[PDB]
């Protein structure tokens, strides 16, 4: 008789999501050769599947995905997107939760009503734990942004994207990049747009130019495109960065967002100290908010 294999063990991956269980709904968002989509996991056929974030290639940095799962599926924080599984095809997909009231970007400008101070300086202190949690694995985010923050609640903010995320070597201070054509200029350090050199302290910059989305209710005229923009000048093309980074050597800043007391705007202008070494540290921008919250 014809002989065929023995069928062994078949423990089902919770982390393993079927790609013809999977189905698209919307796109989300865009950034660095990832799209990512809103999808159902349907494997009973009937609309009542899970809703998951998946992040897929937009149609060779394939290894770059790979990195970007392996970094989030070893992250647990409160203040962190969760990991959720993949979808293989050499292809990858990285499925996360799905957080349907978007980044700040989204619900921003439509909850200012629900949204005071108090509840901004609590998200200041949400990213900043996210934040520190991730430098304390040693890795440099590098695309801080509140389009890169996502609302689980009107109580709870997670940082919801990891794709510019490298691990800084062990008793190094930086992480030099070489990929960087569509680098987020105007939330980033001197130090970054001079050298291409990524520190932790690159992140506490890009932080303060995300604590000032946050408070100006990330409204688009008052981005920190917009305003850079508004300092420098909008039509130098090529010639943008270098005047950006002449304006930062002046010792110019984003100015202080309307309705935004002296205290928080000094709290910012610690994330924006010239030299890295200067800047305020993740663990005292929380006691800093902490004491204006109490
Ligand atoms: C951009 O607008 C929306 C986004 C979402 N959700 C998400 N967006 N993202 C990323 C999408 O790409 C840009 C960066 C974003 C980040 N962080 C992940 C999620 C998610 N895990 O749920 C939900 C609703 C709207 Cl309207």
Known sequence: ????????????????????????????????????????????????????????????????????????????????????????????????????????????PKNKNKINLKQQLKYAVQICKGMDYLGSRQYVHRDLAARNVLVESEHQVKIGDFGLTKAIETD??????????????????????????????????????????LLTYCDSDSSPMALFLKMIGPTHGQMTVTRLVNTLKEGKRLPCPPNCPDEVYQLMRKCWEFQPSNRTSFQNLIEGFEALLK
């Not at 063990?9 to 796109?27: C, G, N, Q, S, Y």
């Not at 149609?59 to 979808?87: F, M, Q, S, T, W």
């Not at 201070?173 to 990929?179: A, H, L, R």
């Open 1 to 108: 008789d014809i002989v065929s294999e023995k069928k062994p063990a078949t423990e089902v991956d919770p982390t393993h999501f079927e790609k013809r269980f999977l189905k698209r709904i919307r796109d989300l968002g865009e950034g660095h050769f990832g799209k990512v989509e809103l999808c159902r996991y349907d494997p009973e056929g009937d609309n009542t599947g899970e809703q998951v974030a998946v992040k897929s290639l937009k149609p060779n940095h394939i290894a770059d995905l790979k990195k970007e799962i392996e970094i989030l599926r070893n992250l647990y924080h409160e203040n962190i997107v969760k990991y959720k599984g993949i979808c293989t095809e050499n292809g990858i997909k990285l499925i996360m939760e799905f957080l349907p009231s978007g980044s700040l970007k989204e619900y921003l």
């Open 172 to 213: 190094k201070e930086y992480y030099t990049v070489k990929d960087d054509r569509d680098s987020p200029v105007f939330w980033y350090a001197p130090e970054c747009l001079m050298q291409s050199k990524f520190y932790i302290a690159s992140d506490v910059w890009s932080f303060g130019v995300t604590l000032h989305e």
